[PDB]
From a paper:
Several plasma membrane transporters import proline into the cell, including the Sodium/imino-acid transporter 1 (SIT1) encoded by the SLC6A20 gene. SIT1 belongs to the SLC6 gene family of amino acid and amine transporters, and the larger Neurotransmitter Sodium Symporter (NSS) superfamily. SIT1 adopts the classic LeuT-fold expected for this family of amino acid transporters, while ACE2 is composed of peptidase (PD) domain and collectrin-like domain with transmembrane and neck regions. As with the homologous ACE2-B0AT1 complex, the structure is a dimer of heterodimers where homodimerization of ACE2 is mediated primarily by its neck domain while the ACE2 and transporter subunits interact via three distinct sets of contacts.
We therefore determined the ACE2-SIT1 structure, with an open-conformation peptidase domain, in the presence of glycine to a resolution of 3.46 Å overall and 3.76 Å for the transporter alone. Without a secondary amino acid substrate, SIT1 has undergone structural rearrangements that open the transporter’s cytoplasmic gate. The greatest movement is a rigid body 17° tilt of TM1a. This movement breaks most of TM1a’s closed-conformation hydrophobic interactions with TM6b and TM7, and the hydrogen bonds of Ser11. Rather, in this inward-open conformation TM1a forms exclusively van der Waals contacts with TM5 and TM7. The open conformation of SIT1’s cytoplasmic gate is stabilized by TM1a’s interactions with TM5, which has moved laterally within the membrane. Within the SIT1 map determined in glycine, there is no apparent density for amino acid or chloride, though the binding site is similarly resolved to the pipecolate bound structure. Most pronounced, the unwound region of TM1 has repositioned, distorting the hydrogen bond donors and acceptors which previously coordinated the substrate’s amine and carboxy groups. The tilting of TM1a has shifted the carbonyls of Ser20, Ala22, and Val23 by 1.4 to 2.3 Å, disrupting the Na1 and Na2 sites.
Residue numbers in the entry:
A (entry chain C): 11 to 582
B (entry chain A): 740 to 768
């Protein structure tokens, strides 16, 4: 019935493609990132998703069991599929914390991101809140309290820490309570995000200067199309959104009937995920284009007002549509006065604003708060959207934590030493203790590090290992014969070609290009808030942050080879 | 402080729910 299709939708719609995708799309030039993603969907999404589902269905085991049955000296990869998930559980729930925060500041008539606080004389606005938008000031100062540079970090902020603790308690409560009731929840926890995004698209397309954002998002600029970072980010994002590498897909496929259809399931899941991500990006970039157009209008208005006040002009004589000509006339009238303010005049254009209006790990929150503050009944829409985002985050965290606990649940030694219900509490406590780092003054920088590198190389390496093992280790012909015996209609030559030498080759080529780019540039830099300019400035990563990122990647990458060496020694 | 009051209420509700769930689990023991 339609319940199965709704369950597939719920598995496909998650916090990943709704929150992470718009920020990546804006970072990498919009269309110049959207084109690879689709290309990275028909090549790496559907084939690898179907391979994972088929492996899970055929093996009738968990992730560790499935990757141990195929080959002994490869079973360590099953441990790796845990480690990455662990790191995800380290930081992903932090997102929910922010949601909680942004929910709790939604029951006030003067919304905290609606009106800028006064300087103190009760006559003007804060310099940071004047240079930056109200939403950006609320996000970067009253929510994260971010420090200008990663080198200087303060103590653990108590309010974000409390929000994170609340998020972890909610996750633990959901773990203890729900195990099989989701069948009812799927009737409601799967269609609400689509309704919310429909409402926000309705609002966004009614805003002035909204189509500029869509035109920017769908424009594939060839200048930035050749950036390897865009391809690598698209690949890691599609792998993170589909759930590849985490091992949850294999665990879910192990619980389904041997005659259950998988090709249709994989294609439907992949296409639904891509379409949902595209729709969310459309809405977010409509709102972002509205913000950029509003900033452009504001800058033109400020320049026009300044020129009118310094040249004794009429209130309406100088407009945006006839600016430069008038300036030229002033250049012909008396350049002595014109040069007195020539450095003061600013050159503002739509392209530059669209490139740098809003950016960072919190593009979704800033953009949607901007959209909410331009509504009719702001509080209701804010509550609905943040509840939807919190529900998506809780569902994704439930899936990830179940994938983490399942190998630990299967541990006979662990189960006989501690109660099964206490392992979840211990995991939640440890994850909260580790994730308390992201609540410092510079915690957002660490969150950015763990959003860029805790899932980039690890997922790609795990997927490459899986496709190599199912490609040549077990034998593609044997796998096809087993699948044909299980269900018939043996794999079409498209799937066999994709699994044989297309996906591994493409992933290896992307990795080589990324490594070469990093080696040649050698300038891995992060964005940092600058209150004086009220913008984002690129700054070089310090040594210790690079060491932390390298260690985080290296543990996940070396989880497999170390266990392979251990198994080889055990054999020898 | 609207947000602090709402956070306190939500935390109390979550604490009560977790306490009753753990009590039921202990009963399962
Ligand atoms: C606020 O008052 C102080 C008093 O010294 C003054 O220095 C400051 O310029 C005032 N603010 C503005 C925006 O003029
Ligand atoms: C604006 O354009 C003029 C024209 O060359 C240039 O001299 C100036 O540096 C640019 N920027 C500003 C802030 O005026």
């Amino acid at each position: 019935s339609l319940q199965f299709v709704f369950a597939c939708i719920s598995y496909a719609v998650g916090l990943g493609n709704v929150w992470r995708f718009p920020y990546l799309c804006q970072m990498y030039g919009g269309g110049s990132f959207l084109v690879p993603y689709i290309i990275m969907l028909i090549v790496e999404g559907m084939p690898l998703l179907y391979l994972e589902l088929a492996v899970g269905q055929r093996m009738r085991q968990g992730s560790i069991g499935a990757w141990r049955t195929i080959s002994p000296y490869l079973s360590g990869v099953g441990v790796a599929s845990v480690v990455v998930s662990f790191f995800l559980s380290m930081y992903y729930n932090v997102i929910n914390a922010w949601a909680f925060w942004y929910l709790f500041h939604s029951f006030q008539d003067p919304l905290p991101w609606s009106v800028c606080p006064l300087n103190g004389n009760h006559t003007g606005y804060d310099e940071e809140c004047e240079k930056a938008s109200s939403t950006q000031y609320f996000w970067y100062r009253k929510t994260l309290n971010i420090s200008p540079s990663l080198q200087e970090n303060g103590g653990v902020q108590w309010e974000p820490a409390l929000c994170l603790l609340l998020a972890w308690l909610v996750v633990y409560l959901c773990i203890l309570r729900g195990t099989e009731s989701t069948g009812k929840v799927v009737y409601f926890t799967a269609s609400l995000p689509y309704c919310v995004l429909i409402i926000y698209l309705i609002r966004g397309l009614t805003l002035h200067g909204a189509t500029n954002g869509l035109m920017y998002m769908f424009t594939p600029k060839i200048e930035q199309l050749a950036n390897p970072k865009a391809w690598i980010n698209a690949a890691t994002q599609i792998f993170f959104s589909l759930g590849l590498g985490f091992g949850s897909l294999i665990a879910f496929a192990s619980y389904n009937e041997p005659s259950n259809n998988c090709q249709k399931h994989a294609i439907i899941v992949s296409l639904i995920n891509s379409f949902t991500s595209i729709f969310a990006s459309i809405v977010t970039f409509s709102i972002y284009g509205f913000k950029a157009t509003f900033n452009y209008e504001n800058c033109l208005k400020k320049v026009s007002l300044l020129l009118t006040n310094t040249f004794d002009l009429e209130d309406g004589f100088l407009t945006a549509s006839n600016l430069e000509q008038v300036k030229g006339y002033l250049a012909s009238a008396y350049p002595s006065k014109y040069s007195e303010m020539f450095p003061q005049i600013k050159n503002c254009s739509l392209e530059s604003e669209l490139d740098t209006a809003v950016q960072g790990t919190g593009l979704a929150f800033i953009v949607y708060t901007e959209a909410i503050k331009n509504m009719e009944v702001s509080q209701l829409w804010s509550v609905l959207y943040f509840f939807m985002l919190l529900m998506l985050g809780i569902g994704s965290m439930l899936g990830n934590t179940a994938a983490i606990l399942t190998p630990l649940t299967d541990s006979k030694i662990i189960s006989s030493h501690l109660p099964k219900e206490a392992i979840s509490g211990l995991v939640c406590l440890v994850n909260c203790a580790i994730g308390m780092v992201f609540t410092m003054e510079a915690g957002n920088y660490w969150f950015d590090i763990f959003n860029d590198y805790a899932a980039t190389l690890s997922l790609l390496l795990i997927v490459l290992v899986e496709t190599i093992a199912v490609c040549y280790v077990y034998g593609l012909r044997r796998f096809e014969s087993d699948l044909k015996a299980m269900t018939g209609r043996a794999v079409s030559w498209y799937w066999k070609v994709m699994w044989a030498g297309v996906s591994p080759l493409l992933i290896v080529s992307l990795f080589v290009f990324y490594l070469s780019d990093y080696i040649l540039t050698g300038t891995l830099k992060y964005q940092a808030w600058d209150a004086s300019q009220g913008q984002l400035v690129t700054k070089d990563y310090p040594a210790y942050a690079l060491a932390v990122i390298g260690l985080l990647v290296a543990s996940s990458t070396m989880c497999i080879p170390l266990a392979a060496l251990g198994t080889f020694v055990q054999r020898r | 402080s609207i947000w602090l009051i709402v956070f306190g209420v939500v935390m109390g509700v979550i604490v009560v729910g977790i306490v009753i769930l753990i009590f039921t689990g202990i009963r399962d023991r």
